[PDB]
Design a protein around this ligand. Structure first.
Ligand code: 5DY
Lengths: 277, 269
C-alpha cells in the first residue's frame, strides 16, 4: 500500500501532544494514538487518541502531500528516541527495526549505530553536541580544555548533561575523564538544567544542539546562550528513519532537499524554532 | 583502484607544485601533526594535493581498504546541468556520471538537483551561504539596497556552474539578482576572491566554509557574519554504488569520533 504505519515521539517543539476536542483534532494537528498501560504489572492497555503538532509534524504533512502517502501516526511507549539494550532496540528506532513502523518522524538524531539497522533520510535540521551557558561565560564547545581537564582551572567548571542518552554515551567514549568528572552534575531533565544554569548552580549544560538552540531562542530575558554553530561537536542532523532498504527513502530524500532549497524548511524553522533571543 | 575527482578549493583542497623529483614537500602543522599529501593530476601535470578533503579521502581509503588516484576536474567546475534536446552535467558532476571519476571528494554541496542523478553520503561538513566583501565596504547582507536593486556601480557575483548558480537561477524571487549575477560570475572562487581584493568585484556570494576562512587569513577581506542559507557538503558517488553505505557510516563515525573536529581545527579554524 501507500498507507504507512509511522511512529513518533513527544519532544516540543518538534512534536507536541494534545488531547482531542467536537471530539476530534483541530487544524495544525493530526491524529496520533498512544497505547496507555492499565498498570505497571500488566501488558494490558488502551489505545488513546491524541493530537500531534509541531515542526516534525509539519514535515510529515509536506512529505505526505509531496510523496503521496497516507499514514497512521502513533507515539512510542517503550523508550524514547532509540537505545540498543543488550542488543535489543527500544524507542522509535525499535519500532522501525522490528517492523511495527515503516517510518519514524521526530527529533531523531542520525548516528552510525542506528544507521546500521535503519536507513536515514537526509537530515532536515542540524544538531550535534552543543553547550549552553549564562551570557558572559567563555567556552569554545565540548572539546574545550575547561571540559577535558576541568581541574586545570580553579575553581573547576561545574557542568553536566542529562544522563542515559546519546550525549553521555558519546562523552563517555571520547573523553573518559570528562565523563567521570561531570557525573556529579547529572541533571534530571532539560528544564532542571536550565534552572540550575540560571540559579548559578551550574556553569554549563552539555546537550543536543537543536534543543539548546530552541531553549536559548525563547529564554526569558535572553540570559542563556549557546556556543556558535561552528563549535558544535559531532555535527549531524535529525532525520527520518526508514526500514532497511526502504523504497520510500529516495523520494523522501528528494522531497526534503526540495523543501530546503525552495524556502519551505526555513519557514517551518521560523514557524517553530526561532525565538526572541 | 577508485578514480577520485576533486577541485581546487582552499581550505578543503590545496594544489601545489611537486618537487623536482615529482614528490611532495614534507610538512608538519604548527601543532606537530604531519601534513598528508597525495599526488593529483590536473590541467596534464602531476601536482600535490592536501587539505580537509584529502585528509578525509585518506581516512576513507584506510577505513574501507581501497586504493585511489586523484585528479582535478578537467573543466574546473563543480557541476550544473546544461542543455545540449538532451542534457548533460558539467564539472565534477559530469565526470562522475560519465565514469571519468568513481567518487567526488570535494566541498560538493548536497542539493535536490544533483541528488536526482547521483548518491550523496551523509554530510561531512555543515555550513551555508554568506557574502564576502573588501574591508571598507559596508553592506548588510543578502537583503541590502545594492544587492536587491543591482546596478553597475556595485558588482556582485558567484562562481559559474556551481550550486550557488543553481540556487539563484531556480527561484523566481531571485530573478533580479540572478540577472545581474549571471553577467558577472567567475570561473572559480579563487579568481572572485582575488577580484574582491583587487576591487574589481564588490561582493562574492559563496560557501561560508570557504569565505569565513578567507577572511580569517586575509585582513583586507570580511564577510557579512551571517548565513542566509544552510547547506552541507557530501561525498558523491554514482547511483546504487556499492561504496555508498560504508562511506556514510564512515562519515558518521568520523563526526562522532572527534575526527571531523580535528580536521576543522587543522584546516578551517
Ligand atoms: N535527538 C536525540 C539525541 C539528543 C538527546 C541527547 C541525550 O538525551 O543525551 N543528546 N542528543 C544528541 C547526542 C549526540 C549527537 C551527536 C553524536 C551522535 F550523533 C546529537 C544529539 C536522539 O535521537 O537520541
Amino acid at each position: 500500500d501507500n498507507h504507512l504505519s509511522i511512529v513518533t515521539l513527544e519532544e516540543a517543539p518538534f512534536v507536541i501532544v494534545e488531547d482531542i476536542d467536537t471530539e476530534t483534532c483541530v487544524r495544525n494537528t493530526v491524529p496520533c494514538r498512544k497505547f496507555v498501560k492499565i498498570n505497571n504489572s500488566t501488558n494490558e492497555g488502551m489505545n488513546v487518541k491524541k493530537c500531534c503538532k509541531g515542526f516534525c509534524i509539519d514535515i510529515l504533512k509536506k512529505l505526505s502531500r509531496t510523496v503521496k502517502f497516507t499514514y497512521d501516526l502513533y507515539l512510542v511507549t517503550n523508550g524514547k528516541h532509540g537505545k540498543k539494550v543488550n542488543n535489543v532496540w527500544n524507542g522509535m528506532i525499535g519500532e522501525v527495526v522490528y517492523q511495527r513502523a515503516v517510518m519514524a518522524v521526530g527529533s531523531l538524531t542520525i548516528n552510525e549505530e542506528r544507521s546500521e539497522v535503519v536507513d536515514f533520510s537526509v537530515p532536515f535540521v542540524e544538531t550535534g553536541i552543543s553547550v549552553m551557558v549564562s551570557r558572559g561565560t567563555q567556552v569554545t564547545g565540548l572539546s574545550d580544555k575547561k571540559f577535558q581537564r576541568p581541574h586545570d582551572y580553579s575553581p573547576p567548571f561545574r557542568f553536566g548533561t542529562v544522563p542515559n542518552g546519546s550525549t553521555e554515551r558519546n562523552i563517555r567514549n571520547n573523553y573518559p575523564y570528562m565523563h567521570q568528572y561531570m557525573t556529579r552534575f547529572n541533571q534530571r531533565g532539560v528544564e532542571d538544567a536550565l534552572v540550575s544554569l540560571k540559579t548559578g548552580k551550574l556553569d554549563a549544560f552539555i546537550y543536543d544542539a537543536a534543543v539548546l538552540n530552541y531553549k536559548a531562542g525563547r529564554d526569558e530575558g535572553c540570559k542563556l546562550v549557546t556556543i556558535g554553530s561552528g563549535y558544535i561537536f559531532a555535527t549531524t542532523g535529525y532525520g527520518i528513519a526508514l526500514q532497511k532498504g526502504s523504497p520510500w527513502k529516495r523520494q523522501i530524500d528528494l522531497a526534503l532537499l526540495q523543501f530546503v532549497g525552495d524556502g519551505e524548511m526555513e519557514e517551518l524553522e521560523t514557524l517553530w524554532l526561532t525565538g526572541i533571543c | 583502484r577508485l578514480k577520485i575527482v576533486t577541485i581546487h578549493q582552499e581550505p578543503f583542497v590545496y594544489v601545489k607544485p611537486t618537487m623536482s623529483d615529482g614528490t611532495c614537500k614534507e610538512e608538519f602543522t604548527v601543532n606537530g601533526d604531519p601534513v598528508k599529501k597525495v599526488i593529483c593530476t590536473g590541467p596534464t601535470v602531476p601536482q600535490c594535493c592536501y587539505g580537509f578533503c584529502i585528509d578525509l579521502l585518506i581516512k576513507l581509503a584506510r577505513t574501507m581498504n581501497f586504493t585511489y588516484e586523484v585528479h582535478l576536474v578537467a573543466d574546473g567546475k563543480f557541476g550544473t546541468q546544461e542543455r545540449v534536446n538532451k542534457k548533460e552535467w558539467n564539472g565534477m558532476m559530469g565526470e562522475l556520471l560519465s565514469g571519468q571519476a568513481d567518487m567526488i571528494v570535494a566541498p560538493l554541496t548536497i542539493n535536490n538537483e544533483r541528488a536526482q542523478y547521483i548518491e550523496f553520503s551523509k554530510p561531512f561538513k555543515y555550513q551555508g551561504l554568506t557574502i564576502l566583501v573588501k574591508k571598507g565596504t559596508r553592506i548588510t547582507g543578502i537583503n541590502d539596497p545594492r544587492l536587491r536593486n543591482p546596478s553597475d556601480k556595485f558588482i556582485y557575483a558567484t562562481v559559474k556552474q556551481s550550486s550557488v548558480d543553481i540556487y539563484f537561477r531556480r527561484q523566481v524571487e531571485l530573478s533580479t539578482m540572478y540577472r545581474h549575477m549571471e553577467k558577472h560570475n567567475y570561473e572559480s572562487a579563487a579568481e572572485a576572491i582575488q577580484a574582491v581584493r583587487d576591487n574589481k568585484l564588490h561582493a562574492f556570494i559563496w560557501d561560508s566554509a570557504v569565505l569565513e576562512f578567507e577572511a580569517s587569513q586575509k585582513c583586507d577581506l570580511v564577510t557579512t557574519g551571517e548565513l542566509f542559507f544552510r547547506s552541507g557538503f557530501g561525498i558523491g558517488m554514482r547511483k546504487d554504488s556499492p561504496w555508498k553505505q560504508n562511506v556514510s557510516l564512515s562519515i558518521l563515525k568520523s563526526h562522532e569520533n572527534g575526527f571531523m573536529e580535528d580536521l576543522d581545527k587543522t584546516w578551517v579554524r
